[PDB]
């Protein structure tokens, strides 16, 4: 008796006192104080104010600088669009619902907001995976006579969309479901109830293997092989000071990317491992949603790592922000 069930929702609060209401109809101030809903709104405001310009500017400078329109950069533009899906599908809606204290758009808006917020985070995840694969292919050259071109980069972008739909679409047609989560102001996959009608258990396993384990394996493999190949080549050219500088910075960047991924990936593993053990207690609205709470900031720090630290993008944005000069 941890929460209150209803059609299309699970409020993580007991109704033994009779105060629980539908998250589609009335504010959830028994889950959190009104000022804590305000702080949730302030958090959404921070993410919008930093997340929209950085990701929009990534698209804008690509229009004003011909050198950026390389196939190896297509996936980075795909990343910037995905973050805009998170910013407008998720953060903007949540800022609005937050200030009402419940999901005022009803179960239909729940499926829309949940689909587009999940699709945005999914496209971003697989863009990082596809980028790791493309870089591994270009550097480690695992195919004897192969050249990465425009058509290959388009496949890579299309691949992220297929994988993203493979996660975000089934809950709209009866495999798992979208419900309000956490403080009930935004919607997502149901990892909270074993809704046997939609076979929630098998979707969690599918999400865990395909959309959680596999991305980590691919990112670690591709980048490990890449760092190995680069350190191998530099070892054969130690007379070149620039070759050694290039090896050092490639390694430093791979570490940063992998640390950035782990910072977003481990909290889910931690929370899930804590839920696998200790399979006895009730989980507050915050607990199973702490990883998602902090994973939202990836809409800001991913473009900072993959674009603002890209030597080309940086100079083009400086020139664009400086009205043409510098
Ligand atoms: C968490 O738990 C609470 C408490 O159990 C639930 O809230 C109750 O929900 C029921 C509906 O299922 C409410 O019952 C309905 O109340 C209507 C209004 O009643 C108020 O007004 C009348 C005068 O009009 C007062 O006399 C009364 O004291 C109330 O203040 C009634 O119009 C409804 O009557 C109709 O349905 C019943 C059958 O349920 C028939 O017997 C009637 O003839 C009529 O057809 C009905 O009684 C109840 O008022 C709610 N209580 C509170 C405190 O809100 C939540 O739904 C639950 N949360 C979740 C998410 O499930
Ligand atoms: C992009 C998101 C749609 C997706 C997401 O929301 N997930 C949360 C639920 C999920 C799958 C992943 O996590 C689990 C952990 C343990 C057991 C089952 C699990 O199911 C996600 C989020 C962040 C990262 Cl880092 C990754 Cl790789 C993937
Ligand atoms: C993000 C900021 C972290 C620290 C904030 C701690 C604020 C606690 O502040 C207290 O919270 C109570 C909650 O109902 C209020 O009723 C009290 O009036 C208030 O003093
Ligand atoms: C850009 C942000 C705009 C957000 C507008 C939020 C409007 C909140 O609307 C308020 O919701 C309450 C229920 O929670 C009602 O009781 C109030 O009457 C209503 O004014
Ligand atoms: C390094 C990984 C970059 C992509 C991380 C995207 C974070 C997605 O976060 C997900 O968003 C959904 C909709 O808001 C929520 O329903 C999920 O609970 C949450 O895990
Ligand atoms: C997922 C892939 C992560 C790759 C991280 C590789 C980090 C290697 O880092 C390197 O390891 C060498 C070991 O001799 C050290 O001598 C170097 O100082 C160090 O730069
Ligand atoms: C700094 C400590 C923060 C603890 C995490 C608070 C978790 C509250 O739960 C939150 O509810 C929101 C509205 O439904 C969702 O948008 C968030 O994804 C979810 O984390
Ligand atoms: C060239 O590269 C620089 C051109 C001149 C730009 C100077 C203005 C930058 C100010 C950005 C910071 C605004 C902070 C807003 C606070 C919310």
Closest Cα to atom 1 of ligand 8: 322
| Structural domains of the chain ordered from first start | 1-326 (1.20.1070.10)
Closest Cα to atom 5 of ligand 8: 322
Largest CA distance in the chain: 76
| C-alpha pair distances (Å), 266 with each of 43, 88, 124, 304 | 22, 26, 17, 20
- Indicate the Cα dihedral angle 166, 167, 172, 173, nearest 10°: 50
End-to-end CA distance of the chain: 63
**CB 33 less than 6 A from any atom of ligand 3:** yes
Element (H, E) at 189: strand 186-189
Q: Determination technique for this PDB entry? A: X-ray
How does DSSP assign 299-322, residue by residue? Answer: HHHHHIIIIITSHHHHHHHHHHHT
Ligand 4 pocket, Cβ-based, cut-off 6 angstroms = 27, 96, 99-101
- CA 185 to CA 100: how far, in whole Å? 8
C-alpha 295 to ligand 2 mean position (Å): 10
Helix (H, G, I), strand (E, B) or coil at 4: strand
Give the number of other Cβ atoms within 10 Å of residue 238's Cβ.
10
- Indicate the Cα dihedral angle 226, 230, 231, 237, nearest 10°: 170
Nearest listed ligand to the Cα of residue 44: 7
What sign does the CA torsion over 124, 129, 131, 132 have? positive
Closest Cα to atom 19 of ligand 5: 292
Q: Which of 135, 141, 52 is nearest to 89 (CA)?
A: 52
Q: Which of 323, 225, 306, 319 is nearest to 54 (CA)?
A: 306
Cβ burial of 140 (10 Å; 0-12, 13-18, 19+) is middle
Give the number of other Cβ atoms within 10 Å of residue 67's Cβ.
11
Residue with tokens 């209150």: 4
C-alpha 77 to ligand 1 mean position (Å): 53
List the helix and strand counts (H, then E) for the chain.
Answer: 11, 4
Q: Are 167 and 208 in contact (CB under 8 A)?
A: no
Q: Which of 35, 39, 42 to mutate to test the pocket of ligand 3 (most atoms within 8 A of CB)?
A: 35
Contacts 24+ apart (CB under 8 A), 227-231: 227/251, 227/254, 229/139, 229/140, 230/139
β-strands 9-11, 178-181: how paired?
Answer: unpaired
- Bridge partners of residue 188, in order along the sequence: 179
Token pair belonging to 78 = 């795909």
Element (H, E) at 5: strand 4-6
How many residues does the structure list for the chain?
326
CA angle 253, 257, 258 (to 5 degrees): 115
Q: Are 127 and 84 in contact (CB under 8 A)?
A: no
Give the number of other Cβ atoms within 10 Å of residue 269's Cβ.
15
């Amino acid at each position: 008796m941890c929460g209150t069930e209803g059609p299309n929702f699970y409020v993580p609060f007991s109704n033994k006192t009779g105060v629980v209401r539908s998250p589609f109809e009335a504010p959830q101030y028994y889950l959190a104080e009104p000022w804590q809903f305000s702080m949730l709104a302030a958090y959404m405001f921070l993410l919008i104010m930093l997340g929209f310009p950085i990701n929009f500017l990534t698209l804008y400078v690509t229009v004003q600088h011909k050198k950026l329109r390389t196939p190896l950069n297509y996936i980075l533009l795909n990343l910037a669009v995905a973050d805009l899906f998170m910013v407008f599908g998720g953060f903007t809606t949540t800022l609005y619902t937050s200030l009402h204290g419940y999901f005022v758009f009803g179960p239909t808006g729940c499926n829309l907001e949940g689909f587009f917020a999940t699709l945005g985070g999914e496209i971003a995840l697989w863009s990082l995976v596809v980028l790791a694969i493309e870089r591994y292919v270009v550097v480690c050259k695992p195919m004897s006579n192969f050249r990465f071109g425009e058509n290959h980069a388009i496949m890579g972008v299309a691949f992220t969309w297929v994988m993203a739909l493979a996660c975000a679409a089934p809950p709209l047609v009866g495999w798992s479901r979208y419900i309000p989560e956490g403080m009930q102001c935004s919607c997502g996959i149901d990892y909270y109830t074993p809704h046997e009608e939609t076979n929630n258990e098998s979707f969690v396993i599918y999400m865990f293997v395909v959309h959680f384990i596999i991305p980590l394996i691919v990112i670690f493999f591709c980048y490990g092989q890449l760092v190995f190949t680069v350190k191998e080549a530099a070892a054969q050219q130690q007379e070149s000071a620039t070759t050694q500088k290039a090896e050092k910075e490639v390694t430093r960047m791979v570490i940063i990317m992998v640390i950035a991924f782990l910072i977003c990936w481990l909290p889910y593993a931690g929370v899930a491992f804590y839920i696998f053990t200790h399979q006895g207690s009730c989980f507050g609205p915050i607990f199973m949603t702490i990883p998602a709470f902090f994973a939202k900031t990836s809409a800001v720090y991913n473009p900072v790592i993959y674009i603002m630290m890209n030597k080309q993008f940086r100079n083009c944005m400086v020139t664009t922000l400086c009205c043409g000069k510098n």
